[PDB]
Amino acid sequence: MNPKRIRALKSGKQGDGPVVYWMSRDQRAEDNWALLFSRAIAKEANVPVVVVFCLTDEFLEAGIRQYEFMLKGLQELEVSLSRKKIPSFFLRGDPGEKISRFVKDYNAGTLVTDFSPLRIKNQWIEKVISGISIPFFEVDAHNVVPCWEASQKHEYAAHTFRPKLYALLPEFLEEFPELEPNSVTPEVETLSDVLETGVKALLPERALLKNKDPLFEPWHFEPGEKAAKKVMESFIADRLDSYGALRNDPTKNMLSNLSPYLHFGQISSQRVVLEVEKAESNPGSKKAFLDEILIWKEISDNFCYYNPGYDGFESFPSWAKESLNAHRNDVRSHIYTLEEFEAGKTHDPLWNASQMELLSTGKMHGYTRMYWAKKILEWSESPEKALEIAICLNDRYELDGRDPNGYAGIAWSIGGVHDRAWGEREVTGKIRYMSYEGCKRKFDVKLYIEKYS
Ligand SMILES: Cc1cc2nc3c(=O)[nH]c(=O)nc-3n(C[C@H](O)[C@H](O)[C@H](O)COP(=O)(O)OP(=O)(O)OC[C@H]3O[C@@H](n4cnc5c(N)ncnc54)[C@H](O)[C@@H]3O)c2cc1C
Numbered sequence: 001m002n003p004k005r006i007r008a009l010k011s012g013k014q015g016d017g018p019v020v021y022w023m024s025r026d027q028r029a030e031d032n033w034a035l036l037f038s039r040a041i042a043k044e045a046n047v048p049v050v051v052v053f054c055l056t057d058e059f060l061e062a063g064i065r066q067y068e069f070m071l072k073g074l075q076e077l078e079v080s081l082s083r084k085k086i087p088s089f090f091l092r093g094d095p096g097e098k099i100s101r102f103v104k105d106y107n108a109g110t111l112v113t114d115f116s117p118l119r120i121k122n123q124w125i126e127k128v129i130s131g132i133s134i135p136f137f138e139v140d141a142h143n144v145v146p147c148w149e150a151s152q153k154h155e156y157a158a159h160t161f162r163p164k165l166y167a168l169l170p171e172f173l174e175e176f177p178e179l180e181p182n183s184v185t186p187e188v189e190t191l192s193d194v195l196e197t198g199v200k201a202l203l204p205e206r207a208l209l210k211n212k213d214p215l216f217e218p219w220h221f222e223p224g225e226k227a228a229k230k231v232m233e234s235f236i237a238d239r240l241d242s243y244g245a246l247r248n249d250p251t252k253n254m255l256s257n258l259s260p261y262l263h264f265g266q267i268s269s270q271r272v273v274l275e276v277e278k279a280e281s282n283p284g285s286k287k288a289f290l291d292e293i294l295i296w297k298e299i300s301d302n303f304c305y306y307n308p309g310y311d312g313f314e315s316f317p318s319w320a321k322e323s324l325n326a327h328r329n330d331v332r333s334h335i336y337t338l339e340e341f342e343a344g345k346t347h348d349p350l351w352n353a354s355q356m357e358l359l360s361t362g363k364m365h366g367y368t369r370m371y372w373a374k375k376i377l378e379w380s381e382s383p384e385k386a387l388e389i390a391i392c393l394n395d396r397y398e399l400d401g402r403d404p405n406g407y408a409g410i411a412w413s414i415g416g417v418h419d420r421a422w423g424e425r426e427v428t429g430k431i432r433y434m435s436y437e438g439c440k441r442k443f444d445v446k447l448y449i450e451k452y453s
Pocket residue numbers: 247255256257258259262263292293294296297300364365366369370373394395398400401402403405406407409410412413
């Protein structure tokens with residue numbers, strides 16, 4: 001176990017009680033460095049290890065599609081942890097008041113949590129640190145290389161972060177040891193009841209069409225840690241060979257579809273890299289997939305970690321902020337509201353079809369996501385309004401929303417983060433421009449539109 005994967009958030013006196021794992025971002029039993037580190041510390045202290053998940057009050061800022069996917073994965077996760085003699089306690093309320101109360105009530109000795117660069121995660125840490133007296137650690141179980149170890153500053157481009165990540169691969173890209181069960185079973189409600197009351201409070205704000213029927217289709221992605229492995233095996237055996245040539249074709253389902261499992265942490269990205277690296281397929285397709293799940297994925301955590309205002313206009317590069325400021329007073333072709341973008345009532349059938357896929361499946365195609373966000377910038381009153389509309393529609397209907405990948409992706413499409421300066425156009429400026437005629441020459445837009453009516 002590499003000691004570089006774990007950071008110390010707060011020092012203090014260690015108690016004689018069970019080591020608590022505050023699971024937030026990585027909801028899985030296998031390939032969880034934070035869970036493995038908690039077990040190792042528990043073994044050395046001759047005490048059991050426990051897992052504590054907090055059902056925060058911000059679940060109403062999302063939809064049922066993200067609430068059911070996460071909770072139904074925990075129901076399978078609770079059974080798996082119980083088979084390892086590891087109890088799980090699901091708390092409802094503020095993490096600042098629930099974690100600090102659980103530590104005091106159960107005489108916790110050491111508190112461990114997974115790493116997350118999001119602002120909401122840092123808000124909870126500030127509350128938890130102020131109310132605990134036991135050692136506090138955090139472990140990066142999401143990225144293959146720890147976020148603080150890949151780079152010590154903000155990487156403005158992928159070609160500068162790629163050499164730093166690949167050079168650290170021989171040290172951190174390794175196999176996961178078996179999660180040892182607890183020696184004995186140690187000494188706040190049913191998840192089924194939490195899902196029933198949670199959905200009931202989310203029914204009035206459910207996405208529906210004119211016929212009062214739901215828009216979301218839950219049969220596309222089955223939640224759970226077992227289902228994530230089945231999808232990963234399907235991609236390597238069926239879609240990995242043609243991934244490098246059909247990644248930019250929205251009409252073909254040639255993607256891995258691992259993001260909803262990678263977002264909630266139901267499957268480890270390092271596990272996906274290990275299986276792909278030992279798989280024999282097209283070298284140009286493996287390189288394309290490795291560049292997306294390692295470079296572009298972990299650079300999204302580098303963006304949110306080394307930029308506090310990652311969701312603001314100030315995190316954009318200097319060239320993009322000056323170019324957008326020089327085209328603020330340009331007459332936009334169209335100005336749509338948030339309700340018009342949400343309902344897909346624009347003049348672009350390609351953009352509307354992209355939005356419908358977001359509403360129905362909850363996972364828009366990787367290529368169309370770049371087009372869907374750049375048209376928001378072109379059809380908004382200001383770049384600040386484009387950021388809010390893109391972030392809102394992303395975190396609300398994307399099954400992988402509220403993730404550093406989304407914020408880095410939105411900042412790339414609107415502010416050109418991790419991008420270069422292109423030809424200077426009106427309104428958009430030097431930000432990379434994507435046209436409807438450009439997509440027609442790239443893929444069959446007629447089939448993509450006709451699929452999502
Ligand atoms: C405007 C916009 C919004 C986005 N919204 C989200 C979002 O809400 N949540 C989210 O997790 N990702 C988001 N992304 C990144 C990307 O679109 C998705 O991660 C990708 O579509 C995931 O689906 P997939 O696994 O089938 O694609 P794949 O090509 O099979 O990629 C597999 C994994 O590689 C990573 N990856 C691939 N492409 C990217 C990328 N462009 N940026 C970062 N990581 C990547 C992801 O971890 C992904 O799960 C967004 C990108 C843009 C441009």
